[PDB]
Structures are given as structure tokens and as C-alpha cells.
Amino acid sequence: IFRDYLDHIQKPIYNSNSITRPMFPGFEAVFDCKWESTGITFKEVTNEDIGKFLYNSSTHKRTYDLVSLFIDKIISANKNEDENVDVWFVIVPDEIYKYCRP
Amino acid sequence: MKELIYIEEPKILFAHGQKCTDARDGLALFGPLNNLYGIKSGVIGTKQGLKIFRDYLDHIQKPIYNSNSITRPMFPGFEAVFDCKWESTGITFKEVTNEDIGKFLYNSSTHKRTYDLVSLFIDKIISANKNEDENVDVWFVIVPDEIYKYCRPNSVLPKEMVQTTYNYDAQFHDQFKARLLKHTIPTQIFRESTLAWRDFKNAFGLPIRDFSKIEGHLAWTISTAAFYKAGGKPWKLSDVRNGVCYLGLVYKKVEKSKNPRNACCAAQMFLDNGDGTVFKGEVGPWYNPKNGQYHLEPKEAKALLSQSLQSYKEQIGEYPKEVFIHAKTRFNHQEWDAFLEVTPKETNLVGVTISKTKPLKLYKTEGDYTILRGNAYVVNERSAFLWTVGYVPKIQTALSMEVPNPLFIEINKGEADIKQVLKDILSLTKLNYNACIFADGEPVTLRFADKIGEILTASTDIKTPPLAFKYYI
Amino acid sequence: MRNKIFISHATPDDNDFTRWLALKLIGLGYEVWCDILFLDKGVDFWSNIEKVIREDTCKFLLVSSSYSNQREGVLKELAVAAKVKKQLKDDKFIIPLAIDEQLSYDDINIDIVRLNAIDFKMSWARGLKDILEAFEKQKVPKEVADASKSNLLYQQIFLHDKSVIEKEEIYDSNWLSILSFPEELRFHEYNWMLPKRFDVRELTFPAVRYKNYLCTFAWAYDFTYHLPKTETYHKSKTIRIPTEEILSGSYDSNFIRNAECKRLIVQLLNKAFELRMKDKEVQEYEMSNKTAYWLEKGKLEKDKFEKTMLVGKQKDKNWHFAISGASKLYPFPVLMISSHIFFTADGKKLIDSSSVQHSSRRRQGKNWWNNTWRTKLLAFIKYLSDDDTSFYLEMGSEEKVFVSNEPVKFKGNVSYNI
DNA sequence: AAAAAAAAAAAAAAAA
RNA sequence: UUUUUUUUUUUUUUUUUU
């Protein structure tokens, strides 16, 4: 989904009424910067692992475990991988948002 | 009249699946593998030193030439070789006033003055990393020459200019790269002489570090280091077999704590699912008591090898089928019994020792030129001599200056066929990312492990250091 | 059909730019013709280029530099290119490429002054991008991009003149082979006969203490002078062993283990070597661990053995070649020799500053290549000899160690040429 | 307090 | 410390014997 959305992003994007909101002419057009789907350093989070933590009765423990699972991989990629990444996009599923809030 | 075998020169892979024996020539024509859009560069230093960095960056923007192109290839320009943008515009500059550097430098205590000089730079680097919107890939630390002359061990400050911490080494570079480990900030230190040297001259008037003929290779060795530190993959190996992790141990001395404690450090090279090579550090530093033991006690050996096997299992799925544990020192049975227990049945443990001490020096009968590189004298199925330093026709000269010294490669433990052991070490001498040279005099594992050990023994407060080389070389 | 791209340039000066641009364009899929690309030359080439510029060239690229601006061959190629431009009625044919910062646009050749030139002065990558865009716009013939073509052309043309070739070569090492040893290693129980607080380094023949056994190849009563008490020793007390068994590795027991029995042959031969060097009256410098043996100024006829100089002059410093020897028995029974250069102020007294000695040694070795190391080493070891084929280390009144005077030779199947 | 047989830490120059 | 190479200084430990 992220790859598809970015592929959409380079191309111009159109809303219903351009008078209210100016049309989006594309990332490389307005910011004149290269933001392509090539070069994305990807670290996977398997469905089983994210499902093990999610189905917990205690909100605080499940939240801490879910955060730990992501942050450990992020730190490992930052300190033990040659690639340099400007930003770290953290795509989280919707069931977590539903069931990891107070 | 003893037989002497010759091993084919290794070929390293470049972009578009193309192979080339040389690194410089292959890079200058095919470019690096990965598309690193641009190098956002940050610089620290005085105003007098910033102009020199700007001038050198402008220089390497344009092509530069050596005295003879055959012995040292020409440099087509940074964007020409690396197809990536690195301009003098967009550098984030942070100031180091001359009064600040002269206040601390002229101190009687070498440890105190070097600690202060490292602190002055590191505070500003951390503050820029944490408190500024600008993103910088690499922090080029321009240091003057006075800091170079008077901020290392055994450096005597002259009595005339002495105007006025002991847990850290007097070495500026080691302490500097050690204390930045927690923040994971890729940095590279630059002498002002390594920069546009023509300003710095001796009494005779010629530059002290005259680099007239070696400008092109200087640009090659600076550009490649900058590209690697930014997250680039200039080249890789191609002939390395699947399922072969290597791992390289080296022992360094620690002076701060009573008992040298002989810190042992490792660098691990292997393959990844696919075709890309992974060459990182395997750093769990295991300190070894006794003044000169250099043999690692069973618990730490088990921990080291378990960590090395786990870093392979997590990235490939299953354990390596055959590893070549290299080392500068011979293996006692105490270590090997510990190693054997950790590994499963399928793994084939091999313990190899590489050294240069014994003086075997092959002189050809006629000619002002040395032996070919790749020549090997096999003593027996367990021991051999490999001339990884010597003549190669491509670079028009021998890598050495005098007659070279080979590497005594012996299979202390495991079984291993000596031909394959001689076939991988010579290829292993090709992955030197700190310098863009045709070949390296020793395998890079025993070299980059030495480097990371020289960095990790400068700070006693280090904890869980990063495993990436860009923070070290 | 015209589908070749001609790159004219000044041949002996613009090799780098022409090479880089051609190897880039061929990899990009563009046909390239140039004089440096084709390997070998003949009388026909002067004709060949002409017909190409008239029959196969679709675009003409002129490397503009202070050299190629007024080069006669470049000028002739420019003239024929301009005239084929006229005949094709295609104005965008000659595409100049300016690569010199010192050659301003106001000093270009007359055929090029009115023609726009792609700027290579600042960035070669920008110039190459401009070239690609212009060639795409003008619909120049092109094939699919394939860097393998560039790699193959690099292999057949350029790493091509300097390649691995198979031919036998023989090399001279720094190992002196040991021809023979004394038959039996002797373990004499001197015990109280030899005073305990005594040093064996002053003994006439080499001998090392181990337990209460003096170990040496020398005869029982050779140490009578230094040890007057040894006249009343009994020769049946010796533990003589067939040393050849030790070299094979057959012998081992509780009395001695072969690994620590091989060391008693290595210290022994080392002391024999230093004793022999004392016999040859060559003086010594103390190293940090070893000792180096060098020779005075005047002992050799005109300070040179054979025809090769061993002691020479450098400003006020007399430099002397020296060797360091050590017996090794693991690969074969051999003696390894290493070379050094040491400097003196008057030819007799060594300069005491280690840093100055190291710096001056580096200065001298700056210009010492293979025929300066091997030749001096072989000359010194031949001067060390006792006959034409070998020398001997004094191991006793009758025991000697025979070591060859020529270094071990190996056989290489691959070599090269200058 | 020695020896040989193996270890590493540091400085100096010079060419790549 | 852009490097790399070749040396020169120390220092130190183990195995063994007294």
C-alpha cells in the first residue's frame, strides 16, 4: 500500500474543486526533490509476531510490547546497517489503532 | 626447485552485474550499485578551514589527473563516477573559533587537552544532530595541524607555548570515533594538509606533503570513503560461495584499566538472501584477562561464536554450512573445544591463522621488479604462503615498494582444503572501503577488526556498540 | 546507413577524456569510432578515417582543448566533417565538446567559433547528460543500452596490454638450505662438574644447559679449557641420539619431547651462526630483539665483494649492508636471512640516534629495487662462504653443519614483462 | 634471569 | 588521522630447565 501510494504521489493528484484547494502537481514538480520507491530500506514485521502482542487484555503491556517490537528493529537498522535513511516510515495496521489506545 | 601455484586474480562486481578486476577502473566506468540521490554534508571547523574544504569539494567536482594514468587511473569527477550529487552548496557549517581551540590545545596534560579538544567538537556535533532541522549524512571534521602535532600519545608540547580525562587515550581519532558511538553519527576526520596541501610548505618551500602526482588517487581515496560513509555500496565480491560466513578475531590492548585485559573484537562477512554481500562488524567485545594471554576463555568464546552464528541465522534463516574463522594468533585447544560445542553438527568449523612475521622474500633472477601477486608456495595441505602483496600488471607496479612479504596461511583447526583457503583470503583482500586501492596487503577482516578494536578500546564507558563500519572507518 | 559516432581528438594528449567518453557511449548503446579504440595501426588508417567520415558517420563530436584546437590531423578531420555536413544539408552535425578551462570560447578554431559547444569544463556528468539529451532529440541511431559491450571493449583494448601470461620463472629466496647435520646430539651429565652459576655463551662451541644435561653436537671434552673440571668425565654418560630421527620426528620420550628437542637445535645453530660471524670478524649492531652483522669501510677491496658494492657513501654517512640470520626447521632445515642498512659517521662508529638511522635507512632504501636487494644479499652470503658451494658452522672439534651458499629456489609457472 | 617462539603499541619517512 | 606499503624502536607473555 505504501509503495502504491508513493507511486501515486510522483504523478499529479487532482481533487474535486481546484479553486478551493490547489491541485497537487507531483513531488518532483513542487519540491524538486527525488522521492522514489527505489531505495526504500525495508524491514519486515511478520503478521504472527504483531498478532502475538496485539491480543492482550492489558492496554499498557500490549502498547509497550508493540512499541518495543518496532523500536528494536529501527535501532538495529540505524546502528547495524550500512544504509543511511533520512526518515523512518512506520506503517501500523488499523487493528492496533482500534485496540492500542487508552 | 619447488612448485609454486598461481591463483587467479579475484574479480569484484559493479553496477549492472558487470565484473572488473580493478576497483578504480570498474567504478569509473560502471559506477556504484545503489542509487544514493545525494550526500547532505555537514562540516565542523574554523573559517580558515572551511574555505579549504569548499575549494577541495569544487576541485573534486571537476576531473583530476595523475602523473601516469596507467599506474594510477584518472578521476572523472565525483558525479561522473558515483552518479550522485555532492556539491559545495547545502553544506551545514558549524563554527569552531580559533580562541576556543587555542585555549585548550596549549595544555601541559596531553590527556586533558585531548579530552577537551574531542569534547569541543563532539558537543557541537551532537547539538547540531539533535537541535537543527538540517539533515547531514556525514560530518567532515576538519582538524588543524597544531591539533595533529600536539594531541596524540607521546606528544611533547614545546615549553614556549605551554599556557596551562586520563581515562581516555591521547589519540584524537580513536577517542573521537569512540564517543560518537551512542548517537550513530557517521563522521570522517580531515587534516588541513590532507586538504589543499599547497598552502602548507616546509623551509625548502615545496609542500611538506607534496601530492602533485597523487592528486587523482587522493581524490579516489577521499571520494570512496565519503560515499561509503553516506550509505553507499561501491563494490562487492562475486566468487564467494553460498553458506560461507568468515568472521575475524583480533586482540588489542587496553591501558586504562589495571591488567591490559586484551579486548577481543570481531568483524563478520557473509552472504545475504539474494546476491548482495553483507560485511558488518560482529562486536560483543569480550575482554580477556592476563597480561599477554591473547587466548580467549571458554565463556567469552562461546558468547562470541553464538552471536556470530545468530547474526547469520537471523538474516538467512539457517546456520552457515562452513565458516572460516580467521585470526592473527594461533588457536589453542581450549578455545576450539568451546567453539565446537556451540556449533551444530552440520556446520564445519575452521580455524585459520594469518601472519607476516617469518621472512620469506622471493627475489626473481633478473629485473628491477618483484614477484607477481597471487603466487603461492604450498608447504603442505595445512600450511601455505600466499603473496597477497606484490606485482600486478594492471597497476603497472608492485603494491609494495621493496620486495614484498607474503602471508603465512595455516589451517590450525578444522580440515579445510588449502586451495580454497588461499582462494578466499586473496578475494577477501578486495573489500577495503576506507581506501580505493587495487588490492590490500592483508585481508580486510583482520584490518577492519583491528580498526574497530582500536576505536572500542579508547572509551571505557562504551555499551552495545553499533555493528556498522561507517561509524568506525 | 550512417549509424557511427565519430570522436575526433588530439591523440597523445586527450587519451583520458576520449577514453572515458567512448567507454560511456558504447555502454549506452551508441556506436563509437575512434583511433584509440582500434588496436594496431597500418598505413590504411589515414584513408579509413576519411571514408568513415564520408560514409558511416551520423554525428561528429570534436573534443575541444588547447591541444586539439590547432592539431593538423584534427584540423583535417574537422574540414572533411564540415564538408560532409554541407553535403548532408544537416546543420546539427558537428557537436563540439569543450573540456579545457584555459581555452575560452573566444579562442576556438574558425570552423567551431560559430558552433555551440557542450560545456564539459565544470562537470563531465552534466556534459554527458547534455550529450544524451541532444542525441535523443536529434533521433540519432541507437541500440539498447548494454554496459557489457563497454566491458568487452575495455578488455580487448585497454588491462589488455598488462595481463596474466604463462611462462616459467625461477626465483631466489632468502633461505640457506642446510645440507647435513652432525650424526648425534650429545647430552653430557656435567652436573657438579660444570658450575651452576656459569654462562654457556662464552663456551668455545655452542652448548645449552637442560636439567643437568649439557646439550651440544660437540665432543665430550671440547669444553676442557673453559671448564678445567671436565677432564675426568665419562663418555658412556652421554645420551647421544640420531638427530636425523629428530628431524624426521620419530624420536620422543620422557627425557625429551621432540618439539622442545627441535628448539635445542635452533638456539644451537643460532649461536653457531653468531660465533661464525665473530670468526669472520664482521662487526655487529644490537637490534631491539636480534643482532645485525655489518662490515667496516676498507676490509673489502674497494669496499665491494665480487663486483657489487656493499659499503657506500651518502653525504657524510657511510652506509653498510647487514644481515640477520635465524635457523628455522619447520619447513625444512634452513637459515632465514633478512637484509638491513646501517649508517655510520666515520665508517667505523655507529650513529647512536635510532631515529636518524631509521630515516637515513628509508632515504637509502627509497631507490633499492629487486636487483639491489637480491644482488647484495647473494654477494654477502657468498662472501660468507668457505668454498664455491657451501659453508660450515663450527659445531665442535670435528662436527660441522654444512649449509649451502645459494638460496632456495622455487619454480613459478606464471610471470610478466616490463 | 636467561633463552627461542609469538604477541601488540607507537613514530618516522615515502610513495601509492 | 585520504592512504597504503616497507621498516625501525621498545615492551610483553607462554612452554620448558635451573
Annotate chain C with three-state secondary structure. Answer: CCCEEEEECCCCCCHHHHHHHHHHHHHHCCCEECCCCCCCCCCCHHHHHHHHHHHCEEEEEEEECCCHHHCHHHHHHHHHHHHHHHHHCCCCCEEEEECCCCCCHHHCCHHHHCCCCEECCCCHHHHHHHHHHHHHHCCCCCCCCCHHHHHHHHHHHCCCCCCCEEEEEEEEEEEEEEEECCCEEEEECCHHHCCCCCCHHHCCCCCEEECCEEEECCCCCCCCCCCHHHHHCCHHHCCCEEHHHHHHCCCCCCCCCHHHHHHHHHHHHHHHHHHHHHHCCCEEEECCCCEEEECCCCCCHHHEECCEECEEEECCEEEEEEEEEEEECCCCCEEEEEEEEEEECCCCCECCCHHHHHHHHHHHHCCCCHHHHHHHHHHHHHHCCCCCCEEEEECCCCCEEEEEEEEEEEEEEEECCC
Round to whole Å and give the CA distance between C302 and C308. Answer: 10
CB of B470 less than 8 A from some CB of A: yes
Round to whole Å and give the CA distance between C164 and C417. Answer: 10
> Given an 8 Å threshold on Cβ–Cβ distance, is B468 in contact with A79?
yes
Round to whole Å and give the CA distance between A51 and B416. Answer: 45
Check: CB of residue C273 under 8 Å from CB of residue C206.
no
Grid cell of C59 as nine digits: 554525428
Cross-strand partners of B249? B266, B327
Round to whole Å and give the CA distance between B372 and C166. Answer: 12
Q: Which of helix, strand or coil describes residue B56? A: helix
Q: Which of helix, strand or coil describes residue A102? A: coil
Output phi, psi for B278, to 5 deg. -120, 120
Check: CB of residue A48 under 8 Å from CB of residue B435.
no
In single-letter form, the type of residue at position C98 comes to A
End-to-end Cα distance, chain B: 43
Round to whole Å and give the CA distance between C328 and C270. Answer: 10
CB of A79 less than 8 A from some CB of B: yes
Check: CB of residue C324 under 8 Å from CB of residue C293.
yes
Which positions ≥6 away from C390 have C-beta within 8 Å?
Answer: C179, C402, C403, C404, C405
Tell me the CA–C1' distance in angstroms for C266 and D4: 8
Residue that is written with C-alpha cell 551512542 in the block:
B182
CB within 7 A of strand D (chain B, 265-324): 292, 294
Chain E nucleotides reached by a protein CB under 7 Å: 1-18
Check: CB of residue C62 under 8 Å from CB of residue C75.
no
CB within 7 A of strand D (chain B, 54-73): 71-72
Q: β-strands B248-252, B263-271: how paired?
A: antiparallel
Encode B267-306 in three state secondary structure. EEEEECCCCCEEEEEEEEEECCCCCCCCCCCHHHHHHHHH
Round to whole Å and give the CA distance between C275 and C273. Answer: 5
Check: CB of residue B403 under 8 Å from CB of residue C370.
yes
Check: CB of residue B188 under 8 Å from CB of residue B140.
yes
Round to whole Å and give the CA distance between A83 and B428. Answer: 22
Round to whole Å and give the CA distance between B69 and B431. Answer: 23
Which positions ≥6 away from B320 have C-beta within 8 Å?
Answer: B243, B244, B245, B270, B309, B312, B347
Nucleotide nearest to C210 (CA to C1'): E17
CA distances C158 to B397, C16, C31, Å, are 17, 12, 18
In single-letter form, the type of residue at position B194 comes to T
In single-letter form, the type of residue at position A96 comes to I
CB within 7 A of strand D (chain B, 236-265): 250-253
Residue nearest to nucleotide D2 (CA to C1'): C199
C277-283 long-range contacts (CB < 8 A, ≥24 apart) are: C279/C394, C280/C384
Cross-strand partners of C72? none
- Between CA A30 and CA A33, with CA A31 as vertex, the angle to 5 degrees is 130
Round to whole Å and give the CA distance between C296 and C312. Answer: 11
- Chain B: closest CA distance from residue C396 (Å): 29
Cα dihedral B93, B97, B103, B107 in deg (nearest 10): 40
Nearest CA in chain C to B380: C331
> Given an 8 Å threshold on Cβ–Cβ distance, is B468 in contact with A39?
no
> Given an 8 Å threshold on Cβ–Cβ distance, is B231 in contact with A83?
yes
Output phi, psi for C405, to 5 deg. -90, -5
Nucleotide nearest to B71 (CA to C1'): D16
Question: E strand or H helix at B41, and its extent?
Answer: strand B41-45
N residues, chain B: 473
Neighbour-count burial of C401, counting CB atoms closer than 10 A to its CB (0-12 exposed, 13-18 middle, 19+ buried): buried
Round to whole Å and give the CA distance between C60 and C85. Answer: 9
DSSP for residue B75: B
Residues B432-452 as b or e (16 or more Cβ within 10 Å = b): bbbebbbbbbbbbbbbbbbbb
- Chain C: closest CA distance from residue B373 (Å): 10
Check: CB of residue B214 under 8 Å from CB of residue B66.
yes
Residue that is written with C-alpha cell 617469518 in the block:
B358
- Chain C: closest CA distance from residue B360 (Å): 6
Cross-strand partners of B413? B351
Check: CB of residue B76 under 8 Å from CB of residue C18.
no
Tell me the CA–C1' distance in angstroms for C266 and D8: 25
Tell me the CA–C1' distance in angstroms for C358 and D3: 28
Grid cell of C79 as nine digits: 574540414
> Given an 8 Å threshold on Cβ–Cβ distance, is C162 in contact with B394?
yes
DSSP for residue B65: -
User: Which has the closest alpha carbon to B250: B236, B237, B268?
Assistant: B268
B165 HSE (CA, 13 A, CB side): 15
Grid cell of C137 as nine digits: 532529440
Residues of B in contact with A82 (CB under 8 A): 228, 231, 233, 280, 468-470
Grid cell of C253 as nine digits: 620420550
Check: CB of residue B430 under 8 Å from CB of residue B10.
yes
Check: CB of residue C175 under 8 Å from CB of residue C336.
yes
CA distances C233 to B41, C192, C237, Å, are 84, 11, 8
B196 HSE (CA, 13 A, CB side): 14
Nearest CA in chain C to B376: C412
DSSP for residue B340: H
Check: CB of residue C412 under 8 Å from CB of residue B6.
yes
CA distances B473 to B153, B252, B435, Å, are 20, 17, 10
Q: β-strands C213-216, C208-210: how paired?
A: antiparallel
Longest dimension (CA), chain B: 69
- Chain C: closest CA distance from residue B159 (Å): 22
Nearest CA in chain B to C171: B364
Tell me the CA–C1' distance in angstroms for C325 and D10: 26
Check: CB of residue B268 under 8 Å from CB of residue B284.
no
CB of C155 less than 8 A from some CB of B: no
Question: E strand or H helix at B95, and its extent?
Answer: strand B92-95
Tell me the CA–C1' distance in angstroms for B461 and D1: 40
Enumerate residues 159 to 198 of chain B having a beta carbon within 8 A of any beta carbon in chain A. Answer: 184, 186
In single-letter form, the type of residue at position B291 comes to N
Residue that is written with C-alpha cell 574497530 in the block:
B452
Which positions ≥6 away from B374 have C-beta within 8 Å?
Answer: B6, B7, B8, B9, B387, B390, B392, B426, C414
Check: CB of residue C8 under 8 Å from CB of residue C77.
yes
Check: CB of residue B8 under 8 Å from CB of residue B425.
no
Query: Which structural technique was applied?
Result: cryo-EM
Count CB-CB contacts under 10 A for residue B256: 14
Out of B74, B368, B371, name the one closest to residue C371 (CB): B368
Chains C and A contact (Cβ–Cβ under 8 Å for 3 or more pairs): no
Residue that is written with C-alpha cell 569548499 in the block:
B54
DSSP for residue B470: G
Task: Locate the DSSP E strands across A1-102.
Answer: none
CA distances C296 to B46, B74, C176, C302, C321, Å, are 55, 48, 24, 11, 10
User: Which has the closest alpha carbon to C235: C275, C201, C190, C196?
Assistant: C190
Cross-strand partners of A10? none
Residues C323-346 as b or e (16 or more Cβ within 10 Å = b): bbbbbbbebebbbbbebbbbbbee
CA distances C309 to C163, C302, C377, Å, are 36, 8, 11
C234 a known binding residue? no
Question: E strand or H helix at B147, and its extent?
Answer: helix B145-149
C99 HSE (CA, 13 A, CB side): 29
Output phi, psi for B191, to 5 deg. -75, 145
B205-209 long-range contacts (CB < 8 A, ≥24 apart) are: none
Count CB-CB contacts under 10 A for residue C64: 27
Chains that touch B (3 or more CB pairs under 8 A): A, C
Round to whole Å and give the CA distance between C299 and C286. Answer: 21
Which positions ≥6 away from C300 have C-beta within 8 Å?
Answer: C310, C311, C383
Round to whole Å and give the CA distance between B330 and B388. Answer: 20
Grid cell of C114 as nine digits: 560559430
Optimal mutation site among C16, C19, C21, interface B, most CBs of chain B within 10 A: C16
Q: Which strands form B138-143's sheet, in the order they lie side by side?
A: B92-95, B41-45, B138-143, B187-191
Grid cell of A36 as nine digits: 522514489
Q: Mind giving me the DSSP string for B392-436?
A: -GGGSSBSSSSS---EEEEEEES---HHHHHHHHHHHTT---SS-
Q: At what angle do helices C15-28 and C147-157 cross, to 10 degrees?
A: 140
